[PDB]
Amino acid sequence: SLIIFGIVNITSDSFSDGGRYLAPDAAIAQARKLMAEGADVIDLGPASSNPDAAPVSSDTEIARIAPVLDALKADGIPVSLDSYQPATQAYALSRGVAYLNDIRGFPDAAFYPQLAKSSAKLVVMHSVQDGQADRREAPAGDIMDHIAAFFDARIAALTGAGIKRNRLVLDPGMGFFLGAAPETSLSVLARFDELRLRFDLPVLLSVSRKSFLRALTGRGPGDVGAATLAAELAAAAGGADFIRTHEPRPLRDGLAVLAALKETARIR
Amino acid sequence: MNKSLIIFGIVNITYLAPDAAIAQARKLMAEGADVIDLGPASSNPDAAPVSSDTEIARIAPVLDALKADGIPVSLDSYQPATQAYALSRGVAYLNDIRGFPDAAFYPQLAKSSAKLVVMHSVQDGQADRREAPAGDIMDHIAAFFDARIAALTGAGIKRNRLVLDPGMGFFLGAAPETSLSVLARFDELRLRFDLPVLLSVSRKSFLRALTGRGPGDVGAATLAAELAAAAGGADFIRTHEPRPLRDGLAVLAALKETARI
Numbered sequence: 001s002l003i004i005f006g007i008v009n010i011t012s013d014s015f016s017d018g019g020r021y022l023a024p025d026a027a028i029a030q031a032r033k034l035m036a037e038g039a040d041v042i043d044l045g046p047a048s049s050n051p052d053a054a055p056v057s058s059d060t061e062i063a064r065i066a067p068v069l070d071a072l073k074a075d076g077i078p079v080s081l082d083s084y085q086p087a088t089q090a091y092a093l094s095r096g097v098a099y100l101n102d103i104r105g106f107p108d109a110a111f112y113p114q115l116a117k118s119s120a121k122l123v124v125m126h127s128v129q130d131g132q133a134d135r136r137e138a139p140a141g142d143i144m145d146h147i148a149a150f151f152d153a154r155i156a157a158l159t160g161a162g163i164k165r166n167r168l169v170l171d172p173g174m175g176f177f178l179g180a181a182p183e184t185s186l187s188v189l190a191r192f193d194e195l196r197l198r199f200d201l202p203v204l205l206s207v208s209r210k211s212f213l214r215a216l217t218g219r220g221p222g223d224v225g226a227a228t229l230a231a232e233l234a235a236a237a238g239g240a241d242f243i244r245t246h247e248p249r250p251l252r253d254g255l256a257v258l259a260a261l262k263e264t265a266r267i268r
Numbered sequence: 269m270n271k272s273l274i275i276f277g278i279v280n281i282t283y284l285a286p287d288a289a290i291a292q293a294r295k296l297m298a299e300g301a302d303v304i305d306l307g308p309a310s311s312n313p314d315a316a317p318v319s320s321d322t323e324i325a326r327i328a329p330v331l332d333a334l335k336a337d338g339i340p341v342s343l344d345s346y347q348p349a350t351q352a353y354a355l356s357r358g359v360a361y362l363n364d365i366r367g368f369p370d371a372a373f374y375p376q377l378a379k380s381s382a383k384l385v386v387m388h389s390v391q392d393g394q395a396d397r398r399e400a401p402a403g404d405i406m407d408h409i410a411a412f413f414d415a416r417i418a419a420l421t422g423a424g425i426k427r428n429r430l431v432l433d434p435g436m437g438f439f440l441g442a443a444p445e446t447s448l449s450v451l452a453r454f455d456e457l458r459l460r461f462d463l464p465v466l467l468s469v470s471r472k473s474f475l476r477a478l479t480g481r482g483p484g485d486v487g488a489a490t491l492a493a494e495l496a497a498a499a500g501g502a503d504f505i506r507t508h509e510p511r512p513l514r515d516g517l518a519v520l521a522a523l524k525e526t527a528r529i
């Protein structure tokens with residue numbers, strides 16, 4: 001099927017909604033709203049990773065997420081922790097989160113023993129930065145080759161340390177995580193099924209509100225809802241297993257139309 | 269045909285004063301419409317009927333302005349007196365939810381250059397909540413167009429003036445599945461008649477059955493259905509909101525470009 005991650009940024013400067021859900025009550029309120037609007041999982045991010053973002057200590061990330069995890073765990077709301085800091089990831093594992101979402105793709109082998117002892121699923125993201133986004137360009141050649149080579153090595157490293165293959169979800173990266181050229185993001189949005197087929201693992205895409213959509217439409221920062229929906233539905237039609245989005249309700253409505261079209265056309 | 273997607277922007281007088289109807293028309297063109305579909309009345313399931321005189325009075329000053337602006341106009345009316353008035357003002361299209369069933373009007377249609385949006389409905393008129401006939405809805409639509417294209421071209425209306433609209437929503441009956449079949453299968457009409465197809469899904473009630481939000485905003489479901497229709501080959505889309513559609517089409521065009529270019 002398709003699992004929707006609803007983005008809740010507990011940050012002062014996330015690129016499209018910084019500050020909004022900084023207070024734990026604001027983040028909790030948004031998380032519950034997003035679940036009612038169609039999210040299946042709340043992707044909780046205590047620090048921005050956009051190009052102009054500023055990092056914070058793991059102590060601060062934990063202080064930002066701790067009351068929110070308390071509430072969502074009591075609420076029975078599944079949580080993915082969007083953090084690249086191993087100390088924050090370790091805290092989340094001790095609270096029993098459903099997923100870890102690492103924009104660095106779990107590159108720290110010293111943390112692998114702790115990853116292996118947990119049941120949490122792991123969203124392993126590829127980036128050309130191997131970290132916080134920036135505006136460099138992607139390597140020359142076929143971007144899908146570069147992404148597959150990354151996942152080949154990182155999956156072998158993770159599974160070699162006792163993280164079971166079926167815990168893994170693959171995110172090829174999107175937007176500035178793929179470099180400054182919108183063509184690179186469009187290639188990955190068009191061709192991520194090559195990753196699903198090669199690795200026989202689910203794929204997660206996060207196109208929501210990313211800058212390459214503004215470049216295609218000629219539009220300003222708060223004007224990218226329609227382009228986002230079109231890109232998300234194209235990802236769904238391409239077979240995406242997870243979509244991480246700021247606005248699950250338009251996505252849910254669009255998926256309802258596409259699913260009903262599919263069922264209606266079936267000859268069985 | 270090769271022509272790229274043409275968007276009809278909906279301006280329904282029902283209340284728009286003419287200055288407001290003119291303003292919304294210009295707005296829709298700025299947002300991505302190619303043609304303004306101007307409707308003086310309402311053909312919802314529940315909207316009251318006005319006289320042909322009232323329809324003409326409502327559109328006359330709006331046509332004045334849109335004509336002066338060089339804005340192509342499709343007149344959405346099923347009343348032949350209103351259609352005759354619009355033809356005499358040289359509109360680009362007539363859009364008839366009855367599909368031009370009145371053969372007494374065919375000589376006047378034959379003498380105009382205007383293109384004709386010929387819509388199918390299970391009512392043969394204003395939308396209601398009856399359900400569809402037994403059998404494949406696509407067969408009933410094809411049979412309707414077989415007969416009506418033959419009738420229109422038989423009266424001297426040249427075939428290439430015709431745009432086919434299979435109907436949508438309550439024009440197809442109360443079941444959402446009937447609209448979904450048509451939205452999924454309308455290309456069958458394109459290839460059977462070698463004529464372009466127009467679809468109008470915008471804000472129709474079957475999309476509400478899928479949002480679960482009843483009377484609430486249905487722009488997202490509308491966009492999804494419109495993009496599916498564009499991807500499925502629709503030649504025209506009639507919509508309330510061209511701008512999100514143009515944005516979505518820009519994403520698909522940029523994606524398409526990667527598949528080959």
Ligand SMILES: Nc1nc2c(c(=O)[nH]1)N=C(CNc1ccc(C(=O)O)cc1)CN2
Pocket residue numbers: 015048049050051082101102103123125133171173174175176177204205206207209210211212244
């Ligand atoms: N799994 C996963 N997690 C994320 C992602 C993402 O793409 N996938 N993006 C995030 C947002 N950071 C940005 C990066 C690039 C851009 C941009 O290109 O506009 C915006 C935001 C953060 N967390």
Ligand SMILES: Nc1nc2c(c(=O)[nH]1)N=C(CNc1ccc(C(=O)O)cc1)CN2
Pocket residue numbers: 311312313344363364365385387395433435436437438439466467468469471472473474506
């Ligand atoms: N060519 C063309 N013209 C129209 C159409 C339409 O579907 N095609 N729909 C119209 C609106 N009438 C409605 C019918 C049904 C529904 C509904 O199902 O909700 C809503 C509105 C009027 N004008």
Ligand SMILES: Nc1ccc(C(=O)O)cc1
Pocket residue numbers: 278280307312468470471472
């Ligand atoms: N509720 C609706 C009212 C009008 C129309 C339309 O003119 O297409 C569609 C839906």
Ligand SMILES: [Cl-]
Pocket residue numbers: 265266267268
């Ligand atoms: Cl099938």
Ligand SMILES: [Mg+2]
Pocket residue numbers: 008009014045047048049082
């Ligand atoms: Mg974030």
